[PDB]
Curated annotation (Swiss-Prot):
Resulting phenotype, residue 243 to R: Loss of ubiquitination by MARCHF8
Protein name: Cyclic GMP-AMP synthase
Recorded name of the encoding gene: CGAS
Organism of derivation: Homo sapiens (Human)
Effect on the protein upon substituting residue 94 to A: Strongly decreased interaction with histones H2A and H2B
Residues of the full protein shown: 161 to 522 of 522
Effect of residue 14 to N: Strongly reduces enzyme activity and stimulation of interferon production
Length: 354
């Protein structure tokens, strides 16, 4: 069965790596906004999350849709946790450039994003070489969506950056000690964390934590051995299993994009289940590349068990249950259980389907 999966992976790589003018088109527009954004005192410190890497794709079944995050450092920062949600917070301070955005003691995501959209909206008309249209309609993150030419789309997200220790709700998260080491966990938790505009139970001016940089760093240094995937004897399939599970959710969502059943699920859920499995199976010997079909099945099985038991702890905030009844209702989880269980029983037709 691992042969059919490797074909799916090979076709995904082929569309990732093919020659495309799109990256320069996005980079051309993106570097314009960064220059213009910096002219404003409130956004003087804005910059790309991972500098050099604009080419981030949430959807791997659509290489035309891009996703860049603009970070903005906020020092002297102080957080208040909203409604015991463990993940949504108010931003308070201790002269700061974001003072035009306050409402009392609380930084207003509403006002900050409005100026953020305003600056971008003007700068993209000053680009008359290409027709760049700004998609509107409210939603905190992604703050804005641009359509460059036709069929090129960029989601721009603004994230606060804090160079302080992580919020107390992350104390028992990132449980990577027996997999990546306590030494690595110290190093990662020394890194900054980020805050993006988000509302629980989608209105309060709340921000949700984001550790995209931590996930990216782990994926590129991912074995218990330091030489994992550096030689022939130490080739693992951790990345392949994550790609296949992200692709499986996307394709099923496309299959039922006219329904509403999978609208509540996102890459967050499959990414979270995968990292839990890596914590369960910390040995490189449990992710051998020849065992790709068995390892992918184990990842699928864990996700189904999460669906049935309605328990998917956030990897960084263990008290946050992404599959709680309030967040996703039993009907949606039972539906996704039926589709995934069907797919596995028939060697996953959905990968071929779209
Ligand atoms: C490495 C594992 C995947 C991962 C990457 C990453 O970058 N992050 N960043 C946070 N931040 C905390 C957090 C984020 C989203 C939600 C959420 C999501 C949907 C609905 C409601 C709530 C809840 C939360 F507690 N979690 C993660 N997981
Ligand atoms: Zn590896």
């Amino acid at each position: 069965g691992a042969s059919k999966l490797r074909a799916v992976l090979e076709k995904l790589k082929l569309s990732r790596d093919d020659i495309s003018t799109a990256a320069g088109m996005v980079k051309g527009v993106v570097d314009h906004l960064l220059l213009r954004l910096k002219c404003d005192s409130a956004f003087r410190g804005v910059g790309l999350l991972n500098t050099g890497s604009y080419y981030e794709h949430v959807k791997i079944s659509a290489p035309n849709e891009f996703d860049v995050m603009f970070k903005l450092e906020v020092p002297r920062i102080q957080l208040e946790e909203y409604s015991n949600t463990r993940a949504y917070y108010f931003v308070k301070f201790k002269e700061n450039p974001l003072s035009q955005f306050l409402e009392g003691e609380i930084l207003s995501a509403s006002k900050m994003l409005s100026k953020f959209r305003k600056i971008i909206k003007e700068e993209i008309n000053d680009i008359k070489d290409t027709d760049v249209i700004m998609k509107r309609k409210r939603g905190g993150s992604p703050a804005v969506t641009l359509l460059i030419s036709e069929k090129i789309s960029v989601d721009i997200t603004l994230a606060l950056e804090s160079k302080s220790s992580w919020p107390a709700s992350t104390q028992e998260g990132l449980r990577i000690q027996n997999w990546l080491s306590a030494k690595v966990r110290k190093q990662l938790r020394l890194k900054p964390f980020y805050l993006v505009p988000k509302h629980a139970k989608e209105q309060e001016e709340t921000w949700r934590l984001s550790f995209s940089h931590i996930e990216k760093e782990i994926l590129n240094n991912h074995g218990k051995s330091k030489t994992c995937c550096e030689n022939k004897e130490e080739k693992c399939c951790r990345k392949d299993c994550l790609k296949l599970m992200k692709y499986l959710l996307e394709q099923l969502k496309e299959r039922f994009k006219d329904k509403k059943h999978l609208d509540k699920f996102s890459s967050y859920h499959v990414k979270t289940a995968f990292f839990h499995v890596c914590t369960q199976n910390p040995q490189d010997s449990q992710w051998d590349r020849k065992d790709l079909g068995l390892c992918f099945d184990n990842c699928v099985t864990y996700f189904l068990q999460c669906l049935r038991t309605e328990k998917l702890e956030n990897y960084f905030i263990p008290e946050f249950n992404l599959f709680s009844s309030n967040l996703i209702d039993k009907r949606s989880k039972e539906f996704l259980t039926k589709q995934i269980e069907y797919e596995r029983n028939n060697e996953f037709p959905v990968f071929d389907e779209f």
